[PDB]
Write an enzyme that holds these catalytic residues in place. Structure first.
Site, PDB file in Angstrom:
ATOM      1  N   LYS A  64       0.827  -1.208   0.000  1.00  0.00           N
ATOM      2  CA  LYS A  64       0.000   0.000   0.000  1.00  0.00           C
ATOM      3  C   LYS A  64       0.855   1.249   0.000  1.00  0.00           C
ATOM      4  O   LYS A  64       0.725   2.147   0.846  1.00  0.00           O
ATOM      5  CB  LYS A  64      -0.989  -0.046   1.158  1.00  0.00           C
ATOM      6  N   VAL A  65       1.725   1.302  -0.995  1.00  0.00           N
ATOM      7  CA  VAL A  65       2.757   2.324  -1.014  1.00  0.00           C
ATOM      8  C   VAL A  65       2.106   3.707  -1.039  1.00  0.00           C
ATOM      9  O   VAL A  65       1.257   3.975  -1.889  1.00  0.00           O
ATOM     10  CB  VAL A  65       3.686   2.115  -2.212  1.00  0.00           C
ATOM     11  N   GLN A 177     -14.895 -10.196   5.294  1.00  0.00           N
ATOM     12  CA  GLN A 177     -15.450  -8.846   5.300  1.00  0.00           C
ATOM     13  C   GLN A 177     -16.848  -8.770   4.681  1.00  0.00           C
ATOM     14  O   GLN A 177     -17.460  -7.705   4.667  1.00  0.00           O
ATOM     15  CB  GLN A 177     -14.514  -7.872   4.585  1.00  0.00           C
ATOM     16  N   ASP A 180     -19.001 -11.478  -1.591  1.00  0.00           N
ATOM     17  CA  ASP A 180     -19.331 -12.771  -2.172  1.00  0.00           C
ATOM     18  C   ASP A 180     -18.383 -13.138  -3.319  1.00  0.00           C
ATOM     19  O   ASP A 180     -18.190 -12.349  -4.233  1.00  0.00           O
ATOM     20  CB  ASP A 180     -20.771 -12.747  -2.694  1.00  0.00           C
TER      21      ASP A 180
HETATM   22  O1  LIG Z   1      -9.340  -2.477   0.299  1.00  0.00           O
HETATM   23  C1  LIG Z   1      -8.598  -3.396   0.659  1.00  0.00           C
HETATM   24  C2  LIG Z   1      -7.299  -3.561   0.140  1.00  0.00           C
HETATM   25  C3  LIG Z   1      -6.552  -4.614   0.598  1.00  0.00           C
HETATM   26  O2  LIG Z   1      -5.330  -4.836   0.103  1.00  0.00           O
HETATM   27  N1  LIG Z   1      -7.034  -5.478   1.549  1.00  0.00           N
HETATM   28  C4  LIG Z   1      -6.161  -6.594   1.976  1.00  0.00           C
HETATM   29  O3  LIG Z   1      -6.747  -7.800   1.533  1.00  0.00           O
HETATM   30  C5  LIG Z   1      -6.647  -8.810   2.557  1.00  0.00           C
HETATM   31  C6  LIG Z   1      -8.025  -9.226   2.968  1.00  0.00           C
HETATM   32  O4  LIG Z   1      -7.962 -10.293   3.891  1.00  0.00           O
HETATM   33  P1  LIG Z   1      -9.279 -11.000   4.414  1.00  0.00           P
HETATM   34  O5  LIG Z   1      -9.831 -11.949   3.268  1.00  0.00           O
HETATM   35  O6  LIG Z   1      -8.780 -11.823   5.688  1.00  0.00           O
HETATM   36  O7  LIG Z   1     -10.288  -9.988   4.811  1.00  0.00           O
HETATM   37  C7  LIG Z   1      -5.802  -8.223   3.682  1.00  0.00           C
HETATM   38  O8  LIG Z   1      -4.422  -8.578   3.498  1.00  0.00           O
HETATM   39  C8  LIG Z   1      -5.975  -6.721   3.503  1.00  0.00           C
HETATM   40  O9  LIG Z   1      -4.875  -5.958   3.973  1.00  0.00           O
HETATM   41  C9  LIG Z   1      -8.296  -5.318   2.006  1.00  0.00           C
HETATM   42  O10 LIG Z   1      -8.770  -6.078   2.827  1.00  0.00           O
HETATM   43  N2  LIG Z   1      -9.047  -4.282   1.577  1.00  0.00           N
END
Ligand SMILES: O=c1cc(O)n([C@@H]2O[C@H](COP(=O)(O)O)[C@@H](O)[C@H]2O)c(=O)[nH]1
Ligand SMILES: O=c1cc(O)n([C@@H]2O[C@H](COP(=O)(O)O)[C@@H](O)[C@H]2O)c(=O)[nH]1
Lengths: 218, 220
Positions: A64-65, A177, A180
């Protein structure tokens, strides 16, 4: 980019042993792993070469630069030196910062993924209102790879509309989160999945289950 | 607030361990607070924080511009504090939940969060500047006590100081190489961050000394 089963594993376990073990258990289902700061800061940048040695998977460095151009260039250099194939860059800090990353990626034979809108609730405060403009900025800069939110399919669809069918789009927020898998793949080329796989009792079955649910999309 | 010697923080963005160590050592009489970012950490490992602590007295601010979802932010903060960083810098633009996650880890671990509001580079004008006053107000509402704002835009740095109040701690990059003036910046910021103007100098000690000489009447 050809992502096996349209499924990218987000490997955010912070222990090397667990991260290697869980990735190994799902290796037949994926060939692309997103490695972020949770693992890299816990186990070092050497973890990237180790993943390549063990799995021969492509590695997306999710860093996430989000710095000034000078610093972004250094971060991209260190990241690609460690063997990352691609790096995720925030668009919010503006065009010059993105360009710095684009320049290094070109020099080292790599790709930049531009993160436009994020998947979490806080994204609504500042990022969402800028996201379409950030995407158009990507198009203007020649960006071909994008990241947008599974949790808001209408926003993901809009991102796809902006960048066109030729651009490559990956999408996190699937599973834990609330996003789907199948709906997300209406718009994204590939889904990113972390906890729904790596926190499962049986990560292999978790991955298999997701793939079965999108089998007609593969 | 942290007591920053000479109101001057070194941005140590050299990517080679030997050079980074040499330069930091050379300026130790002038600076007791070092900002370590990803150029050095991604090149040499998180153990570099440990090595700086071992070698020098210095406090360490981990400039990681944390900019992820709350879940990931928490992990990054935990890893960073575990490694010995006194403080971590976090972006505000991803919103309040993302900032709160960092604050919660900092509280649990007895460390500090710095909230980055507006940035110093030209691209900051595209999206960040328009959100910056609100990001700062959000920080205040969340109980953030430490902030980062841009030396390159004195008018913006002044406004950010107003928003956060006189009690908040404010540090400011963009001094020197990016064009910001040390003295002008210290009208509003508690401390200035300086990188290349020091670490690319033939004599980093002399460069730090010169900056400090120029602000001698502003020291406490
Ligand atoms: O908008 C974004 C951008 C992401 O890179 N991510 C990344 O995607 C991954 C999601 O993981 P998870 O499926 O456990 O929610 C995490 O590594 C998070 O940092 C995100 O969740 N939302
Ligand atoms: O808005 C900001 C925020 C920063 O952290 N920085 C950081 O401050 C330092 C500035 O270094 P320099 O004095 O060489 O320009 C760099 O580490 C950079 O990443 C910045 O320049 N502008």
């Amino acid at each position: 980019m050809d992502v096996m089963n349209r499924l990218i594993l987000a490997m955010d376990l912070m222990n090397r042993d667990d991260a290697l073990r869980v990735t190994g258990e799902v290796r037949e289902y994926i060939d692309t792993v997103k490695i972020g700061y949770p693992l890299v800061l816990s186990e070092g940048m050497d973890i990237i070469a180790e993943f390549r040695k063990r799995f021969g998977c492509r590695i997306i460095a999710d860093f996430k630069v989000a710095d000034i151009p000078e610093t972004n260039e250094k971060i991209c250099r260190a990241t690609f030196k460690a063997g990352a194939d691609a790096i995720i860059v925030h668009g919010f800090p503006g065009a010059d910062s993105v360009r710095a990353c684009l320049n290094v990626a070109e020099e080292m034979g790599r790709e930049v993924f531009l993160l436009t809108e994020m998947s979490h609730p806080g994204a609504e405060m500042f990022i969402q209102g800028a996201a379409d403009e950030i995407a158009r900025m990507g198009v203007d800069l020649g960006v071909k790879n994008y990241v947008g939110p599974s949790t808001r399919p209408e926003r993901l669809s809009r991102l796809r509309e902006i960048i066109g069918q030729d651009s490559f789009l990956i999408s996190p927020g699937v599973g834990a989160q609330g996003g789907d898998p199948g709906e997300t793949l209406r718009f994204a080329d590939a889904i990113i999945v972390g906890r729904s796989i790596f926190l499962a009792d049986n990560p292999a079955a978790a991955a298999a289950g997701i793939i079965e649910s999108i089998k007609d999309l593969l």
